[PDB]
């Protein structure tokens, strides 16, 4: 639906949609920008991620409310409506994964872009895994694991331990271990090792970079406090 709008206008309206907290519009604008076929800048990648994270975040929150009501129940209405929200969530995840596959990841050569997109691929397979129950559940979980793992291998070779993308990736991969893969010890080990190696690299950073890194580092600490 966005094929007739200029790339620059789509980016400008995505930023306007963010200010208006219109995240469905934001995602549609950024999907149109991706489909122009050019690679995304650092700022543009963040706009894409912010838009779809907010859209699927609302869907996940609603799915969790309905799933809880459904569990307490066990007519068809609660199941039907949970299935409706579930299907809409899966549609958004499939859309994001389709953008990554066609063709963001294959064109991403720099570490900061490639790690960003692979982390995104892990995240949205993780969201699919949260609602999966069928014959493809193990394959969905492994698709999330594979994307996170490739992103992790690149980040450890190409990025300092305080890099915010590296930190956010490790944070989310540790959540994957705890919440999806039933591996709480792997989750705790990853969070601790990530936090400690970031701590040892903070001395290299400017005041602003130090603020960026310690902010995500606190989320690792929050999870370790929750988990131990």
């Amino acid at each position: 639906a966005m094929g007739s709008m200029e790339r620059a206008s789509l980016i400008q309206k995505a930023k306007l949609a963010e200010q208006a907290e219109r995240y469905e519009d934001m995602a549609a604008f950024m999907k149109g920008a991706v489909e122009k076929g050019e690679e995304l800048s650092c700022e543009e990648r963040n706009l894409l991620s912010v838009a779809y994270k907010n859209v699927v975040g609302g869907q996940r929150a609603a799915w969790r409310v309905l799933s809880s009501i459904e569990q307490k129940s066990n007519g068809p209405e609660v199941r039907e409506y949970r299935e409706k929200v579930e299907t809409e969530l899966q549609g958004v995840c499939d859309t994001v994964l389709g953008l990554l596959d066609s063709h963001l990841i294959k064109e991403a050569g720099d570490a900061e872009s490639r790690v960003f997109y692979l982390k995104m691929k892990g995240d949205y397979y993780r969201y699919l895994a949260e609602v999966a129950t069928g014959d493809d559940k193990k394959r969905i979980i492994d698709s999330a694991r594979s994307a996170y793992q490739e992103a992790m291998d690149i980040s450890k070779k190409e990025m300092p331990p305080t890099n915010p993308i590296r930190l956010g990736l490790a944070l989310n991969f540790s959540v994957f271990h705890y919440e999806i893969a039933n591996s709480p010890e792997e989750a705790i080990s990853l969070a601790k090792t990530t936090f400690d190696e970031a701590m040892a690299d903070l001395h290299t950073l400017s005041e602003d970079s130090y603020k960026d890194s310690t902010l995500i580092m606190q989320l690792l600490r929050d999870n370790l406090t929750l988990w131990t």
């Binding site: 995240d123 944070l171 989310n172 959540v175 929050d222």
Partner: peptide, 6 residues
């Protein structure tokens, strides 16, 4: 329950 990147 746990924090993912936000």
């Amino acid at each position: 329950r746990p924090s993912s990147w936000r």
